[PDB]
């Protein structure tokens, strides 16, 4: 499924994640633009042989099993297949989990790149919310 940007962010809002460790939902929003354009069937390749999962792009060498990523420690104990679901509630689910690590949203390269310190807002602008 390809979300709307309203869409999506009132899916996101739904989950919790509007303000979840800090972070104020056009963040969420904005990383899910640059990570998947808003499709939760994305997969891309890395050089290392782990695969990003979803919406989110979540990483296969931590955080899902996809049963090709030798040494996967699945912190999220699940498989991959499950984050490309046009329900979000398990990318949400183990993104939660992420953002707590330590690192913050900077665990998204594409949100420390294209977002961190950007008018964030401006994602969520025009939504009924
Ligand atoms: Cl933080
Ligand atoms: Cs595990």
């Given at each position: ?35 998947s ?58 993104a ?32 009924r919310?």
């Amino acid at each position: 499924k390809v979300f709307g940007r309203c869409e999506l962010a009132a899916a996101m809002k739904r989950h919790g994640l509007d303000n979840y460790r800090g972070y104020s939902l056009g963040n969420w929003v904005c990383a899910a633009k640059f990570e998947s354009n808003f499709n939760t069937q994305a997969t891309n390749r890395n050089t290392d042989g782990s695969t990003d999962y979803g919406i989110l792009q979540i990483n296969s060498r931590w955080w899902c099993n996809d049963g090709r990523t030798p040494g996967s420690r699945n912190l999220c104990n699940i498989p991959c297949s499950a984050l490309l679901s046009s329900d979000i509630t398990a990318s949400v689910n183990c993104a939660k989990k992420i953002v707590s690590d330590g690192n913050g949203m900077n665990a998204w390269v594409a949100w420390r790149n294209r977002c961190k310190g950007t008018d964030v807002q401006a994602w969520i602008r025009g939504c009924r919310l």
